[PDB]
């Protein structure tokens, strides 16, 4: 019954490695 | 709080690699917000780089504060005080670039 709608998307920036 | 000052969400999450690591709120001055996961003890130099670097930044135009709080290059979330989910701000080093 739901159904999924796009959204709309700004700056995606990525993430590092970790450290630890 | 699971017993006392700690989070009880390791026993769940983690499918990763060592469990889950901890997550940052970056605000950007283009509102821009992004999440890093970096652990506990992570420099937070990376973090501010990350954002610098892949969004065409040059890094001494740029600083990372938590809560107002700058953000030094060896400097983690662990040393800050800081957990997952806490939040960054990005204010102007100096003159853009």
Same mark, same amino acid.
């Given at each position: 019954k739901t159904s999924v709608a796009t959204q709309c =998307?700004? !700056? $995606? *920036? *990525?993430?590092?490695? =970790?450290? =630890? | 709080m699971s017993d006392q000052e700690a989070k009880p969400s390791t026993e769940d999450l983690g499918d990763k690699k060592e469990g889950e690591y901890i997550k940052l709120k970056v605000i950007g001055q283009d509102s821009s917000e992004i999440?890093?996961?970096?652990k506990? #003890? #992570?420099?937070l130099k990376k973090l501010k780089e990350s954002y610098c670097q892949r969004q065409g930044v040059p890094?001494?135009?740029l600083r990372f504060l938590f $809560?107002?709080?700058? +953000?030094?290059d060896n400097h983690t979330?662990? !040393?800050l005080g800081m957990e997952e989910e806490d939040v +960054? $701000?990005?204010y102007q080093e100096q003159t853009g670039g």
């Open positions: =998307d700004p !700056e $995606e *920036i *990525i993430v590092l490695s =970790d450290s =630890d | 999440h890093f996961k970096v506990m #003890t #992570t420099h890094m001494n135009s $809560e107002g709080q700058r +953000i030094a979330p662990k !040393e +960054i $701000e990005v």
